[PDB]
Structure 1
Amino acid sequence: SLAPGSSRVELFKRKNSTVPFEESNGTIRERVVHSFRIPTIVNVDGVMVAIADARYETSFDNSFIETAVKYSVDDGATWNTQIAIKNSRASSVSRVMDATVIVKGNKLYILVGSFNKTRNSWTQHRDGSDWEPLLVVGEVTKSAANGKTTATISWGKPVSLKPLFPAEFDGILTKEFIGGVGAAIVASNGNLVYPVQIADMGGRVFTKIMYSEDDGNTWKFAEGRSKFGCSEPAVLEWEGKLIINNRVDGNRRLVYESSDMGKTWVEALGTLSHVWTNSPTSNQQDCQSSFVAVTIEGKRVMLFTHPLNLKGRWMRDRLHLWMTDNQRIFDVGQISIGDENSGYSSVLYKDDKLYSLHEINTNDVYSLVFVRLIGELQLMKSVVRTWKEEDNHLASICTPVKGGCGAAVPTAGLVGFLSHSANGSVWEDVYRCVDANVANAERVPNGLKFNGVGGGAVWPVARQGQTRRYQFANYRFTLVATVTIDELPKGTSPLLGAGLEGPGDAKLLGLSYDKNRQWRPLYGAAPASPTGSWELHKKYHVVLTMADRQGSVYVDGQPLAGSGNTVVRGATLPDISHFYIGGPRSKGAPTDSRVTVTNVVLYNRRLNSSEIRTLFLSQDMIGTD
């Protein structure tokens, strides 16, 4: 739960917080609001701006709603309250909802869906006639009298973008669109970039980019899109690419990349796609997430929020915050309290302080809490320092060909590292994200010596459970280790590799050794024929690479026979259960591989010839012992 040091308040209080509702005649009355939903909090020029649905009468989507704002110039000491956007007043369920926000300069751009009288769900409408996509510009103005700083925000007249909306995309006939919800972006080229969600006539849902090159005068829909079934997209920019992180009801969350401003989308199979999901079993309603790029401790990272939803459906208990540098993925922790139902969420890093505005739900009455994430930021900084330190350390090792070293120890795409630190049953990731689980082992410099049944370590992949941070390995990986065989096996015994989920004891790619002192590389389901020669007690360098559905095993820098073969046949992504180190098993054959393994490194890409050599030549230099 919310860390020690951290605190929150109910900033938008259900059945309590009033908003200045304007009547038809133009008189203002403070009007109490049943539920506050769909939060975004942003910084505009030193001013915090918090945007929400004011669901006046009920929490239900197709009800009477207007866009509320609270803003502060003293970082949440005090707030002023507004309705930024009024609904049409056509009926008892007229609504403006699902605010998607862009900050450029002292301006906010708010995109909402406006509906007049439908009582059913937007994806289910018969046509788009009840609907309008509305753009509203706010301008923030500051000024100080008598020391004290004040601000005002003036909201312009909404503009419908309906006329900009094509009737068709690649033959698909369009119905409606809304923003993806939450904080969107100004790209590095100044483009206003909205991720949008689109419903076709059929009610299918897919996502796209809608962008403006001209501070919002005109708008273009880029050519690429998601698979059907993606909603409420969140976008950030990272190393010259848009990254679009999608809601997927009833399956795992799809993440795409585009480096041509949305024209071409490529699924992020090698980093973030299918890592996050809706529930432990992946078959539940999903939920909106915030997805924001920030710079912490001099390092650019992405921040991502989503409930675990252990309760299922819409309950959305146990809101977590993850932080990723697109290689490692760290769970900062649960930011909601206890088993409370949370929901939609927003996150903001401002003046070196970290905040969330998110939903809490009891009996489907919703407030929005404003959270000072004090302990979380402290942990985040520690983790970032660890990442920069070990990367700087590794990259600063002089490798054998001394200004006149070999190529640097590869660090780009280094996800994880198991070295000196270990206790009883845990082998610690140096990068502090995913540890290995250990049995029948004894500590040695930079690793472990296994003896007894199931002696070995399990570095979980699918076995991470819900959030699958090593999902990338199903698409590509390099696994590296330094090994000694300590005792001859009776026949054939395992050493290193990737196991597959499911019946049998199938492996994607692996290495075993046998009684005749030969190696037995395993390329998918192919027979694990012997090759080469080793001797007991001698240190070998082992590298496994898999990319483009092909695998290669290297010993002391050199590929073993069969290397380059196809390890996965078919278009279906492998499902790797774990990496095994030694012969771990909690069942089956009582494997007892007598090996010692140290310095196990995992990369989210197939390393090149020179990188492999460099690792082999630097074996002795990279340990944390």
Structure 2
Amino acid sequence: LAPGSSRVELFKRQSSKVPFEKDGKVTERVVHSFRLPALVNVDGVMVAIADARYETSFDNSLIDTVAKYSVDDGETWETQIAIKNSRASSVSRVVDPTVIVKGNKLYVLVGSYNSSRSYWTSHGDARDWDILLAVGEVTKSTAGGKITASIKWGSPVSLKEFFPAEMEGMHTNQFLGGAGVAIVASNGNLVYPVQVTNKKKQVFSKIFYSEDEGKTWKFGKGRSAFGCSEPVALEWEGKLIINTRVDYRRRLVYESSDMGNTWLEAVGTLSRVWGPSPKSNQPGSQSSFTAVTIEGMRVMLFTHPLNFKGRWLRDRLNLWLTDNQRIYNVGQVSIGDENSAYSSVLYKDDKLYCLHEINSNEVYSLVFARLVGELRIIKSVLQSWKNWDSHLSSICTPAGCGPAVTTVGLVGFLSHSATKTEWEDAYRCVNASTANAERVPNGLKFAGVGGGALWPVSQQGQNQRYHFANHAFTLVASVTIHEVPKGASPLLGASLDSSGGKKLLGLSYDKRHQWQPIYGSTPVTPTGSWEMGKRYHVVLTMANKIGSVYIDGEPLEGSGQTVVPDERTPDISHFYVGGYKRSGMPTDSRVTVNNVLLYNRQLNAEEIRTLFLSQDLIGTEAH
């Protein structure tokens, strides 16, 4: 939890009480565990919705959906049960409450089970299942000169009638919301990303939406891959972005521009960025994933535990900030090494909050945190992004001005800022490590075996912000060679392995004053010519499994070559710059590199030309 931030235990395990209604009687009952936080703003009233697991944290036990609401930004709260289970048995439960806010209404979708003690994904059929929608209506009043609010919960309605018996190649079994908070699309539709099972017990995500305020529901035709559960979605630039949990694998993120009719993996932005554990081989988690506008910039906030412990412990809830280009680790929201899996982040009236689980010995509370430090950090980073984008965009490029330098898809930029061991990302997300580097205006001058900079890709580890590079990228830099090498020496490239010996696409230079563009494993053909001391503009582009290298805005011989065998998807380890940064690699690159730009797409010809013409103008040095 960042400095300045603070929290309270709001839904306190084995302590907080809820109004338990049964057989027409209501008793204030202590709840063992609270899980599945959903925190929203309904017309000025903060509402925290969750599972009240009365007797045990075990999923298949007695659970009602609890709501707490506050009209003073979380200082004080009222408590209610928003949805009660069927009371059919000792383990009846309404589960995975998923919340949409629209106007003054809360739409809450829950699965409902009567007696099963088994996990829902293990059920061979739906005999124990129903899917219910309850609507809470929030009204504010000022009887008494002080703001008050109340929420009237309607009886739940089954939406089972809207669940088709079959979907393409399958027979449906059950579905649930993805938990947390869902959305109202810009066209007014209520949109729930849902997790669905078929009779083979596979799980997959779908979009389940309503065009008539929840009276009828439809499923989008398309779906995620199997294995994607607890989906969470937001709308971004006219598309749904569906961010899914994949146990034991990296999280898959999809985009859909037609209400779920078609799903495309967001390989160029957010898919596979977030791993569920350091080695991405443990269970995943529910995640808060929202689009908000902070100081005029639309961005997305995403949370997920880092889970260093493994299994479902899911310690170290981390918050991420992204404008769909750069992905910034705001930091750890939870405290120390506590288990802290599920969460919900709310941005309301320029304050940031998070309601999240803490788990000791399988007894769970929800803490309500005021993310003061986090918002401060976020605003600082966004200012940096807006400022560098503005700086680059405002440059009058050489003819009257030429086309603007493009910042669309610009993800990282290594320029003037650098410390003894790092070359700093102007966008503040991923620095490059360096060796044998001397600072020069807008870059670094390298020399000696082991010299160079390493801009990590898979080397980022659990969370891989540059994963998009495995699908498409453009890497741009200005370079100057100061010494003729003994053989061929590296200047710039994307490496598939840690050494730099296995390259996806790179540029080297040789003793015959020729460039050696390297296209994957293709035998290298030296080409062109360069002179010592002259600065050259280098662009490496990769898209559709094809690599190109440009020098001074012109593509080198060999460009347009396949760099990825059509079968697999690359796993780039890092970009190397100005050397391999590997003492074990035999080369000595004596070169200066300035202004390294990384884009998450293949730049077009005009864009490349503009960057070439504007090389002397883009540095961060004076700014």
Same fold (TM over 0.5): yes
Counterpart check, 1:48 vs 2:67: no
2:22 aligns to what?
Answer: 23
Distance in 2 (CA, whole Å) between partners of 1:458 and 1:503 is: 11
Correspondence 1:117-156 to 2 at 5 A: 117-156=115-154
Counterpart check, 1:448 vs 2:447: no
1:587: how far off? 4.5
1:504: how far off? 8.2
The CA deviation string for residues 539-580 of structure 1, in whole angstroms up to 9 with x for no partner, is 100000000101110001111001111111123110100000
1:260: how far off? 1.1
Distance in 1 (CA, whole Å) between partners of 2:168 and 2:76 is: 50
- 8 Å Cα contact 1:498/1:579 also seen in 2: yes
1:231 aligns to what?
Answer: 229
2:577 aligns to what?
Answer: 581
TM-score of the pair, normalised by structure 1: 0.98
> Which amino acid in the other structure matches residue 256 of structure 2?
S
1:482 aligns to what?
Answer: 478
2:84 aligns to what?
Answer: 86
1:306 aligns to what?
Answer: 304
Counterpart check, 1:10 vs 2:32: no
1:420 aligns to what?
Answer: 416
Distance in 2 (CA, whole Å) between partners of 1:391 and 1:196 is: 37
- 8 Å Cα contact 1:278/1:286 also seen in 2: yes
Counterpart check, 1:36 vs 2:27: no
Distance in 1 (CA, whole Å) between partners of 2:581 and 2:605 is: 33
- 8 Å Cα contact 2:499/2:580 also seen in 1: no
Match of 2:335, SS state, is: coil
- 8 Å Cα contact 1:439/1:584 also seen in 2: no
- 8 Å Cα contact 1:101/1:183 also seen in 2: yes
2:506 aligns to what?
Answer: 510
1:27: how far off? 2.1
Distance in 2 (CA, whole Å) between partners of 1:292 and 1:326 is: 12
Match of 2:506, SS state, is: strand
Match of 1:597, SS state, is: strand
- 8 Å Cα contact 1:541/1:616 also seen in 2: yes
Match of 1:89, SS state, is: coil
1:494 aligns to what?
Answer: 490
2:102 aligns to what?
Answer: 104
Distance in 2 (CA, whole Å) between partners of 1:210 and 1:108 is: 16
1:210 aligns to what?
Answer: 208
Please, which of 270, 273, 277 is the counterpart of residue 272 of structure 1? Answer: 270
Match of 2:562, SS state, is: coil
1:501: how far off? 2.7
> Which amino acid in the other structure matches residue 391 of structure 2?
H
Counterpart check, 1:601 vs 2:600: no
- 8 Å Cα contact 1:585/1:591 also seen in 2: no
Correspondence 1:233-252 to 2 at 5 A: 233-252=231-250
Q: Describe the shift of the 1:128–1:503 C-alpha distance in structure 2 as closer, same or farther (beyond 3 A).
A: farther
> Which amino acid in the other structure matches residue 239 of structure 1?
E
- 8 Å Cα contact 2:499/2:582 also seen in 1: no
Match of 1:579, SS state, is: strand
1:126: how far off? 2.1
1:527: how far off? 1.1
The CA deviation string for residues 124-159 of structure 1, in whole angstroms up to 9 with x for no partner, is 112101000000010001110232011110000111
Match of 1:136, SS state, is: strand
2:544 aligns to what?
Answer: 548
The CA deviation string for residues 266-297 of structure 1, in whole angstroms up to 9 with x for no partner, is 10010001000110111111111010000011
1:454: how far off? 1.1
Correspondence 1:169-184 to 2 at 5 A: 169-184=167-182
2:282 aligns to what?
Answer: 284
Distance in 1 (CA, whole Å) between partners of 2:61 and 2:280 is: 29
- 8 Å Cα contact 1:324/1:330 also seen in 2: yes
Distance in 1 (CA, whole Å) between partners of 2:350 and 2:440 is: 41
1:3: how far off? 1.0
Distance in 2 (CA, whole Å) between partners of 1:501 and 1:105 is: 52
Match of 2:615, SS state, is: coil
> Which amino acid in the other structure matches residue 602 of structure 1?
L
1:344: how far off? 0.7
2:194 aligns to what?
Answer: 196
2:466 aligns to what?
Answer: 470
Match of 1:620, SS state, is: helix
Distance in 1 (CA, whole Å) between partners of 2:585 and 2:419 is: 26
Number of residue pairs matched by the alignment: 621
The CA deviation string for residues 229-272 of structure 1, in whole angstroms up to 9 with x for no partner, is 00000000000100000000011100000111111111001000
> Which amino acid in the other structure matches residue 141 of structure 1?
T
Correspondence 1:291-330 to 2 at 5 A: 291-330=289-328
Correspondence 1:524-563 to 2 at 5 A: 524-563=520-559
Distance in 1 (CA, whole Å) between partners of 2:585 and 2:184 is: 57
Shifted more, 473-482 versus 499-508: the winner is: 499-508
- 8 Å Cα contact 2:500/2:576 also seen in 1: no
> Which amino acid in the other structure matches residue 202 of structure 1?
K
> Which amino acid in the other structure matches residue 23 of structure 1?
K
1:65 aligns to what?
Answer: 63
The CA deviation string for residues 412-449 of structure 1, in whole angstroms up to 9 with x for no partner, is 00000000011110000000000000000111111111
2:388 aligns to what?
Answer: 390
Distance in 2 (CA, whole Å) between partners of 1:306 and 1:152 is: 32
2:406 aligns to what?
Answer: 410
Q: Describe the shift of the 1:502–1:494 C-alpha distance in structure 2 as closer, same or farther (beyond 3 A).
A: closer
1:338 aligns to what?
Answer: 336
Distance in 2 (CA, whole Å) between partners of 1:279 and 1:589 is: 31
Please, which of 248, 259, 262 is the counterpart of residue 261 of structure 1? Answer: 259
> Which amino acid in the other structure matches residue 534 of structure 2?
K
> Which amino acid in the other structure matches residue 468 of structure 2?
F
1:492: how far off? 0.8
Distance in 2 (CA, whole Å) between partners of 1:435 and 1:46 is: 40
- 8 Å Cα contact 1:523/1:566 also seen in 2: yes
Distance in 2 (CA, whole Å) between partners of 1:587 and 1:205 is: 47
Match of 1:377, SS state, is: helix
Distance in 2 (CA, whole Å) between partners of 1:449 and 1:171 is: 58
Structure 1 segments unaligned to the other structure (5+ residues): none
Give structure 1 regions of 4+ aligned residues with deviation exceeding 4 angstroms: none
Distance in 2 (CA, whole Å) between partners of 1:171 and 1:204 is: 12
Distance in 2 (CA, whole Å) between partners of 1:59 and 1:162 is: 27
Distance in 2 (CA, whole Å) between partners of 1:236 and 1:445 is: 41
Distance in 1 (CA, whole Å) between partners of 2:534 and 2:83 is: 72
Please, which of 375, 379, 382 is the counterpart of residue 381 of structure 1? Answer: 379
Match of 2:197, SS state, is: strand
1:202: how far off? 1.2
Match of 1:370, SS state, is: strand
Distance in 1 (CA, whole Å) between partners of 2:526 and 2:361 is: 64
Coordinate RMSD, CA, aligned: 0.9
Structure 2 segments unaligned to the other structure (5+ residues): none
